[PDB]
Amino acid sequence: AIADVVAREYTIHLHKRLHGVTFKKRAPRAIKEIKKFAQKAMGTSDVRLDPQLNKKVWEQGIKGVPFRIRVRISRRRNDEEGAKEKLYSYVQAVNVKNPKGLLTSVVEEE
RNA sequence: GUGAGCCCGGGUCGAACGGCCUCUAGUGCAGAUCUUGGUGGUAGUAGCAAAUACUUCAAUGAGAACUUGAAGGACCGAAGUG
């Protein structure tokens, strides 16, 4: 019922995933948790993160990752020849007033 | 053949070698913490932990943590990592 090409906006609660992590590993761990979150949500093992999203993760140094982050995951078609996976996800950071209090929402294609 | 050994068959191989009587010796190895060379178990084991720290995208390429560009985050902190 759900098409292959589809974009949804999620709120990732990075606080409970980074609870207790070594301070010099928190931001790389958060990058890997974002990739794992997108893979679980979209079914795609090929996850590509926007550099602005990387800047948002690393905004307050290696141990200052935000508790919540609003992202847009867009499952798109891999048109390159000889690709291992037919689909991939692209994750961007979303400009919102407050990441708290937001539901998962489907982004309109238009 | 008591024995040290001797002989034959089969396989491999490629240019010399053996029996008998005498002559001759640098002539017979398990040891010498030997000598030289080669090879095991240990064992895919002990570790590969000082010098704060890495991450995203793109490109190159058969293959990219430790190549490059950009984007970030840090360190040396002028008796410097200049």
The residue type of A57 is V
Contact (Cβ atoms closer than 8 angstroms) between residue A104 and residue A9:
yes
Q: Which nucleotides of B are covered by protein (CB under 7 A)?
A: 52-58, 70-74
Q: How was this structure determined?
A: cryo-EM
Q: Is the CB of A66 under 7 A from strand B?
A: no
The bridge status of strand A47-49 relative to strand A87-93 is parallel
The 10 Å CB-count burial string (b at 16+, else e) for A57-71 is beeeeeeebbeebbb
If one counts every other C-beta atom within 10 angstroms of the C-beta of residue A16, the result is 8
Q: What angle do CA A101, A71, A47 make, to 5 degrees?
A: 145
Rounded-to-10 torsion of CA A30, A32, A35, A41: -70
Give whole-number Cα distances, A83 to A12, A46, A74, A79, in Å. 29, 11, 18, 8
Which nucleotide has its C1' atom closest to residue A27's CA? B55
Q: Is residue A9 within 8 Å of A105, Cβ to Cβ? A: yes
Coil vs helix vs strand at A48: strand
Resolution in A: 2.2
Q: Which nucleotide has the shortest C1'-to-CA distance from A80?
A: B58
- Asked if A87 and A76 touch (Cβ cutoff 8 Å), the reply is yes
Distance CA A38, CA A18 (A): 16
- Whole-Å CA distances, A44 to A26, A58, A74: 24, 24, 11
Angstrom CA distances, A69 to A2, A79, A87, A97, stand at 25, 29, 24, 11
Instruction: For residues A35 and A21, give the distance between their C-alpha atoms in angstroms, rounded to a whole number.
Output: 17
Å: A58 CA to B75 C1': 17
Q: Cα separation of A102 and A49, whole Å?
A: 21
Query: Which residues in chain A, range 26-55, keep a C-beta under 7 Å from any nucleic strand B atom?
Result: 27-28, 31, 47-55
Residue A28: enclosing H or E segment and its boundaries?
Answer: helix A26-42
